[PDB]
């Protein structure tokens, strides 16, 4: 399946304060009106569906934006040759802490995390770990990226992610918003910038990408409605990046209002 991205994927530039100016820069942004590959697990509930396990290649960036009320996706592990010689990169954000670790171990190919999302087990049993050989770096931080409230329940939560591989770093952007209950393939038309959170100084050369899905043990009331149990309401979107000039506008406080793709039509070039 495919969808249309009106105007999204515009992250914040370098940490430079600009107010009421029109600055243009060249970086790996997301072009407007682009085709986004939708490879979400169709169902599973009331009709077992095939677990979507897309080994999509990491091509100079990826645009991840999931619409979920409860946490259904945990890991965004990368890699190039995921059999014996590849340093893993776990971005699992459970309830306790983050599991950022680049230790060298046996790489597996399990689509789910372990099993048994019920309350009887822990938050995330690391059954994917076979045997460690030699570790290099582990960022076990307390603040986790997964920040789900789940107060009203009727309104979902859209949390975007922008992953880019720097020559000597690994920048990670994220941004959440209380998206209202809507039908699939109905992304809200509106500008929204992502705030920089962390910057891992890693020097690995990843080429492919393979995520994993895991349901949190904090099982709420049975969501018989469409905005309830999100076991079969995944929104796994993937968008590639490419170099393109963008014109950014700043407000009187330091926030970005909108942006111009600079290549859409002869009218945009004149602007």
Residues interacting with another protein, by CB under 8 A? 12, 15-18, 21, 168-169, 195-196, 201-203, 253-254
For 123, how many CA atoms within 13 A lie in the half-sphere containing its CB? 12
Residue 54 vs residues 35, 124, 140, 173, 236: alpha-carbon distances, Å? 17, 22, 27, 22, 10
Cα–Cα distance between 104 and 84 in angstroms, integer? 9
Judged by CB, which is closer to another protein: 21, or 267?
Answer: 21
At closest approach, how far in Å is the CB of 113 from another protein?
29
At closest approach, how far in Å is the CB of 147 from another protein?
16
Judged by CB, which is closer to another protein: 233, or 259?
Answer: 259
Judged by CB, which is closer to another protein: 47, or 168?
Answer: 168
Instruction: Note the Cα 81 to chain centre separation in Å.
Output: 22
Judged by CB, which is closer to another protein: 15, or 119?
Answer: 15
DSSP 238-252: E---EEEEEEEEE-S
Judged by CB, which is closer to another protein: 201, or 266?
Answer: 201
At closest approach, how far in Å is the CB of 24 from another protein?
12
DSSP bridge pairs for 200: 170
Cα–Cα distance between 153 and 37 in angstroms, integer? 28
At closest approach, how far in Å is the CB of 205 from another protein?
11
At closest approach, how far in Å is the CB of 197 from another protein?
9
């Amino acid at each position: 399946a495919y969808t249309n991205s009106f105007t999204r994927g515009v992250y914040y530039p370098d940490k430079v304060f600009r107010s009421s100016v029109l600055h243009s820069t060249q970086d790996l942004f997301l072009p407007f009106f682009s085709n986004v590959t939708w490879f979400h697990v169709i169902s599973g509930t009331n009709g077992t569906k095939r677990f979507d396990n897309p080994v999509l290649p990491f091509n100079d960036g990826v645009y991840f934006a999931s619409i979920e009320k409860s946490n259904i996706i945990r890991g965004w592990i990368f890699g190039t040759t995921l059999d014996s010689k590849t340093q893993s990169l776990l971005i699992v954000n459970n309830a306790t802490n983050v599991v950022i670790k680049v230790c060298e171990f046996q790489f597996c190919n399990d689509p789910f995390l372990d099993h048994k999302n019920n309350k009887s087990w822990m938050e995330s049993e690391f059954r994917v770990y076979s045997s460690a050989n030699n570790c290099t770096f582990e960022y076990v931080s307390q603040p986790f990226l997964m920040d789900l409230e789940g107060k009203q329940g009727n309104f979902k939560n859209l949390r975007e992610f922008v992953f880019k591989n720097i020559d000597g770093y690994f920048k990670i952007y994220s941004k959440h918003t209380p998206i209202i209950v809507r039908e699939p393939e109905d992304l809200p038309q509106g500008f929204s910038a992502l705030e920089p959170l962390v910057d891992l100084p890693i020097g690995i050369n990843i080429t492919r990408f393979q995520t994993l899905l895991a349901l949190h043990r904090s099982y709420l009331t049975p969501g018989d409605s469409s905005s309830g149990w999100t076991a079969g309401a995944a929104a796994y979107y993937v968008g590639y990046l490419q170099p393109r000039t963008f014109l950014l506008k700043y407000n009187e406080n330091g926030t970005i209002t909108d942006a111009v793709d600079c290549a859409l039509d002869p009218l945009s070039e004149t602007k």
